[PDB]
């Protein structure tokens, strides 16, 4: 990301619009939660992330 | 027998060619160092005085 | 001045454009190749890889 | 890192610098790219900004 | 130990035991990882 | 220094210093002049938060 | 061949130094390759710690 | 291991987390099983690696 920007940062900043938090979750902290954190959100082809990249 | 040194426990090492490498740099900086310093000590003795 | 002043533009362009680089291809972001490149700009007189990186 | 008698307590036994000093247990003669952010990301910034200030 | 009586730099490894380890690092880079952990340890204030 | 009236927080503060002199590339201590120190020790910074934070 | 006597004892017989000097049973010119733990084994033990703090 | 992590390393390390111990097993202890060990259960394909893997 030296140069212009990744997929993945457009991905996880579109997903941070949409209201989603990784950590947080139901009241319950998770460093890697292994869902709603976006990368394993990416990685698991996930709706939302599809709704982005359509979008 | 032969000879080896006395048994230090110093723990597993790296392969030669790990330890050919930190030799070249060790003698690049080594160098480096001994002719900056010889060039410092040859500077003072370049201009002479007579009588 | 004005022959004089042609050539040295031809002169100083050819003083910018002559720069060498080595040039390594690869995988965007195959670490290897910064691995790689630590070790040749070091010392070192031998390099241990697998064929995909091909030297040649 | 451990949890005794219902506490938790961090403890690193075998860390990579002990003063100034360094441990042999790990290996740091290896290079990583580091990737920070450009320009685009400063205009992504604003943009967002922008986007709020619009909302209100 | 770590008896020595020749100076080599940085040659010398030790074998120990890694009990517990997490891999699963939810991010494409180091650099991006500390990001994380940066707004994970806000959130832990938070929390 | 992290607690404060019962709650913790981190405030993460930038201290500016600026060396004199540059870091000798050269010399025999910064060996291989390469990248991974620097990731081993960022997260030597987040000790005292971490034990403060295991006292709460 | 005998039973050790219900007694386990550890000798060795053949062993690579006795002492100072070197035994002639085995030989040193082989090169192995040994492999350290690098950052991201770091990283894994500190997000060990972390996993066992969130649980906490 | 000198650059990046080993697969066995990741393999194992998540093992480790599924909480199985390689030594002690069942109050009697071997320093290699053949059965419990993580060599010798990453080779035969067990279904904890199998399960690990596709995780």
Chains 1, 8 share one sequence.
Do not use: W
Request: hydrophobic residues 35%.
């Amino acid at each position: 990301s030296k140069h212009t920007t990744t997929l993945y940062e457009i991905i996880e900043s579109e997903l941070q619009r949409l209201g989603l938090n990784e950590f947080v979750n139901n009241d319950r902290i998770h460093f890697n939660d292994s869902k709603h954190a976006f990368m394993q959100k990416m990685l698991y082809f996930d709706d939302d992330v599809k709704q982005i990249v359509d979008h | 027998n032969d000879y080896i040194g006395k048994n230090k426990d110093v723990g597993l090492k790296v392969e030669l060619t790990e330890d050919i490498d930190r030799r070249i740099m060790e003698h690049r900086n080594r160098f480096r160092r001994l002719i900056f310093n010889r060039y410092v000590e040859f500077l003072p003795l370049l201009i002479n005085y007579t009588n | 001045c004005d022959e004089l002043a042609e050539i040295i533009l031809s002169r100083f362009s050819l003083i910018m454009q002559s720069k060498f680089s080595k040039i390594f291809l690869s995988d965007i972001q195959d670490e290897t190749i910064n691995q790689f490149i630590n070790k040749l700009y070091n010392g070192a007189p031998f390099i241990k890889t697998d064929k995909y990186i091909d030297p040649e | 890192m451990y949890i005794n008698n219902g506490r938790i307590n961090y403890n690193n036994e075998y860390g990579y610098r002990r003063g100034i000093y360094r441990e042999p247990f790990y290996s740091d003669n290896a290079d990583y790219n580091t990737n920070s952010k450009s320009y685009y990301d400063y205009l992504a910034r604003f943009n967002g900004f922008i986007f709020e200030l619009c909302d209100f």
